[PDB]
Design a protein around this ligand. Sequence first.
Ligand SMILES: [Cl-]
Ligand SMILES: [Cl-]
Ligand SMILES: [Cl-]
Lengths: 171, 171
Amino acid sequence: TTNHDHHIYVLMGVSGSGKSAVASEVAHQLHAAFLDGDFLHPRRNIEKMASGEPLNDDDRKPWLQALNDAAFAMQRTNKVSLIVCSALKKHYRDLLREGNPNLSFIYLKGDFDVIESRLKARKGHFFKTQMLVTQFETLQEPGADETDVLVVDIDQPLEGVVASTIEVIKK
Amino acid sequence: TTNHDHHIYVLMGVSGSGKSAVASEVAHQLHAAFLDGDFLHPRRNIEKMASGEPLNDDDRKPWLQALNDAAFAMQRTNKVSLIVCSALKKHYRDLLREGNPNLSFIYLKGDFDVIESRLKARKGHFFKTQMLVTQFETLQEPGADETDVLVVDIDQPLEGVVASTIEVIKK
Ligand SMILES: [Cl-]
Ligand SMILES: [Cl-]
Ligand SMILES: [Cl-]
């Protein structure tokens, strides 16, 4: 079940890498559909993330399944769809690919120090530093074997990350 | 859990009222979070619709519950969130409201004729008569008892609808 004329790009990478900011702007510029995956977290998950407890594979399963289904729904009527999903592990990405051969990834990439230096916080907010440590540890960067992954350098201003993402989509 | 300083606006109305086009632009202009609820339809709903059949309460229930959790997720970190959901019956609206006192509705309101011509304005669009008839049959316009409903007149250019929506949100 796929419309092969249409395509889905999952913007992945650790929390704090600016995925939503980028996806939002890219989709608006390209007149593409956009979905922030963070919003499909099941109730249980939301409660857990806020109380500070990092999620586990089983917690993410239903979330990834929901995202798989949302991707499918989006590609039915949109030539281009962007979904934000950290998609840190390889089989999370595999879960997203199931039944979605027209889905690929755009990995907003940088090392811990790059990410930390590019972090954009709201006035008065404390950045979840130890969350970034954990996320960076969890991250399994897509190896050459993962052929549907395109990479973007987050070590630049938002406007530059947005144009680079666009170029990769136009590629 | 619920942040009373944050808010969710559900853009509602019959298929064809231009909900997604308005919400997307409003959200972009206001830098708000935006979720097109149509992407959260369970696959079964997707297929039933793709077979030419209107959905019913039973089919919509799980969709609405997913939307209820999505709204909850959105208002955690966003001051303003927009969700597209036809939300045609009062009880559907009450399901979205459950546990979301900071959720309200924006009814993109127009009569059959206004919507038919809006749809036909798009070059090459085939107008589905009976689909629109069924939608209006299903529609239960929010009465005075629903105090969290703002109304916008969709008998104007998209630009004007967006402006009126923003105005209803800012007032
Ligand atoms: Cl992010
Ligand atoms: Cl619509
Ligand atoms: Cl139609």
